[PDB]
Design a protein around this ligand. Sequence first.
Ligand SMILES: *[C@@H](O)[C@@H]1CCC(=O)NCCCCCc2nnc(o2)CC[C@H](NC(=O)OC(C)(C)C)C(=O)N[C@@H](CC2CCCCC2)C(=O)N1
Ligand SMILES: [Cl-]
Ligand SMILES: [Cl-]
Length: 165
Amino acid sequence: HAPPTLWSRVTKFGSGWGFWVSPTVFITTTHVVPTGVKEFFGEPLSSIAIHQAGEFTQFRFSKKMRPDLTGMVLEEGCPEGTVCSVLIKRDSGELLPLAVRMGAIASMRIQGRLVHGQSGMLLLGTIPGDCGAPYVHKRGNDWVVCGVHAAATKSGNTVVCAVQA
Ligand SMILES: *[C@@H](O)[C@@H]1CCC(=O)NCCCCCc2nnc(o2)CC[C@H](NC(=O)OC(C)(C)C)C(=O)N[C@@H](CC2CCCCC2)C(=O)N1
Ligand SMILES: [Cl-]
Ligand SMILES: [Cl-]
């Protein structure tokens, strides 16, 4: 069961969502990031440290933005066959954690954009507004994040998270 604090890390952002991995580190999907604006979470762009690639975007802020959070481990994808949870929040407030069996890490063409990502089979679907939602699994006690929601197949039964370098 994902605890409340873990859900409180999922945060609206641009056209979708992102995830506070630590008090200073926030992750999302590159394409949900809102273009042509000058500040994120009240800080000016000049004060944030961005690493973007493969549709996976990483923000490192100067100050603690979520002092209340304990840092958790951010992997590059997760082992094949790992059953993950996608911590989806809807605009309405509803929480919808989705179980997903993860397949392999692969480069992928998706609408002309190159995506470093990991496919997964759903075990209830996702929707266009869900990009940026974290993929997580419990590794004993600590919770591990391995990706952010980025795409779904025609049917909607297979999904894809962008993963780090
Ligand atoms: C977040 O922005 C969004 C997530 C969508 C989602 O999780 N589920 C949609 C449910 C399926 C409805 C049926 C449908 N309608 N269009 C599509 O599927 C195709 C969407 C597209 N996938 C795709 O092209 O996959 C292949 C056809 C198999 C190659 C897709 O997921 N597009 C995402 C935006 C892209 C992602 C890469 C970076 C540029 C933008 C998308 O809509 N994601
Ligand atoms: Cl937590
Ligand atoms: Cl919450």
